[PDB]
Amino acid sequence: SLPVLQKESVFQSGAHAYRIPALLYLPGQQSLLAFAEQRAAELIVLRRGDYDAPTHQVQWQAQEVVAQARLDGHRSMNPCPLYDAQTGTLFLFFIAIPGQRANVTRLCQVTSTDHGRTWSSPRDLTDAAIGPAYREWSTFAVGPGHCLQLNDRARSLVVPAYAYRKLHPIQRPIPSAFCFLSHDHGRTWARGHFVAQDTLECQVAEVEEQRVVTLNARSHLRARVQAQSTNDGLDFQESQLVKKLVEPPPQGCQGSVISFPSPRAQWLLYTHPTHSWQRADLGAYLNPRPPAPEAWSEPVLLAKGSCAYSDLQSMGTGPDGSPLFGCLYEANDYEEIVFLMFTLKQAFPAE
Numbered sequence: 429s430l431p432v433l434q435k436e437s438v439f440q441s442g443a444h445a446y447r448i449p450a451l452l453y454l455p456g457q458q459s460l461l462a463f464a465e466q467r468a469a470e471l472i473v474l475r476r477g478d479y480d481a482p483t484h485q486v487q488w489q490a491q492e493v494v495a496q497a498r499l500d501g502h503r504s505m506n507p508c509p510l511y512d513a514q515t516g517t518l519f520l521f522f523i524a525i526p527g528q529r530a531n532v533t534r535l536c537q538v539t540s541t542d543h544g545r546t547w548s549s550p551r552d553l554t555d556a557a558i559g560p561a562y563r564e565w566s567t568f569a570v571g572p573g574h575c576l577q578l579n580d581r582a583r584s585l586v587v588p589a590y591a592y593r594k595l596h597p598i599q600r601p602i603p604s605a606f607c608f609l610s611h612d613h614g615r616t617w618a619r620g621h622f623v624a625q626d627t628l629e630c631q632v633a634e635v636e637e638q639r640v641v642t643l644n645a646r647s648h649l650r651a652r653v654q655a656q657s658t659n660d661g662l663d664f665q666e667s668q669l670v671k672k673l674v675e676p677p678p679q680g681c682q683g684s685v686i687s688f689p690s691p692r693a694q695w696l697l698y699t700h701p702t703h704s705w706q707r708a709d710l711g712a713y714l715n716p717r718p719p720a721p722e723a724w725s726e727p728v729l730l731a732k733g734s735c736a737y738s739d740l741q742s743m744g745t746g747p748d749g750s751p752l753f754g755c756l757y758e759a760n761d762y763e764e765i766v767f768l769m770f771t772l773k774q775a776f777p778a779e
């Protein structure tokens with residue numbers, strides 16, 4: 429497999445089990461925040477990591493529970509972090525469900541002004557963000573994984589998500605991805621329009637001039653579903669299967685996507701299991717002509733063996749001068765969450 433700068437297990441089964449990773453890079457801090465669900469999802473835990481380039485290593489600090497990220501009598505899950513470059517405020521969106529076909533799922537948000545050391549009490553955004561549609565869903569979720577902040581005038585916040593809709597009384601709820609939008613730095617929220625039928629966990633990234641929001645979602649088909657928004661996430665008109673991006677047997681697996689400075693304005697990177705018959709062999713895919721579906725490359729092998737959920741983060745310029753990437757993924761039959769750090773040069777030397 430591909431040689432990288434670092435490969436370290438940052439979460440592993442012990443008194444508890446860990447799943448559903450989310451990674452967040454803090455530019456001016458040369459630091460990363462690794463989030464995960466702590467299952468008996470009971471709570472959300474976090475680990476802070478400081479990146480030292482000279483040693484090509486991130487040093488991770490002790491694991492700590494995000495105390496405020498919970499609603500009394502509910503389980504917290506799907507950590508979705510975001511760093512506001514405008515205010516220097518950290519956001520952590522998550523889902524809260526009763527300790528135990530009516531919708532009882534809640535959308536929550538906690539914030540930190542000291543880079544994740546301490547958090548505010550949670551804000552239940554459910555009613556104001558979803559409105560009437562709430563009763564038309566069996567449940568919903570955000571992410572999991574890092575969110576997006578657009579470089580539009582308002583520096584809008586974009587939270588990838590999906591909802592199980594009760595479209596027909598005799599049919600089971602059908603999932604459709606969409607984005608929650610805020611144009612006032614998280615004070616108020618709006619529900620964006622749904623992308624095609626049968627789309628689940630997704631992530632968004634912004635490319636390029638025309639501003640385009642690309643959405644990459646998990647589907648129940650043999651390939652990923654990709655959608656494009658030309659109006660900052662409100663509408664995802666274009667939508668199609670991406671045959672080159674395979675989805676494993678059961679009902680696919682969650683994957684991650686980010687944008688990053690092109691060596692030549694931006695390219696896309698995507699990670700997801702590459703075996704067509706199982707969740708194994710984490711692969712990295714490059715799209716040098718985003719968001720063109722046929723431009724997705726062949727996958728490069730990042731990790732052999734059992735691999736599931738993942739999350740990416742652009743970490744700036746790497747030691748070899750090329751784009752540096754951080755990746756957090758579930759491995760070994762969910763026995764752990766591994767942190768992988770590598771550059772574009774290491775993974776796609778021909779590009």
Ligand SMILES: CC(=O)N[C@H]1[C@H](OC[C@H](O)CO)OC(C(=O)O)=C[C@@H]1O
Pocket residue numbers: 448505506569628
């Ligand atoms: C909120 C929640 O339970 N998330 C689940 C997610 O659910 C997908 C879909 O909703 C199923 O119908 O899938 C998986 C999974 O390993 O496949 C792990 C997450 O923890």
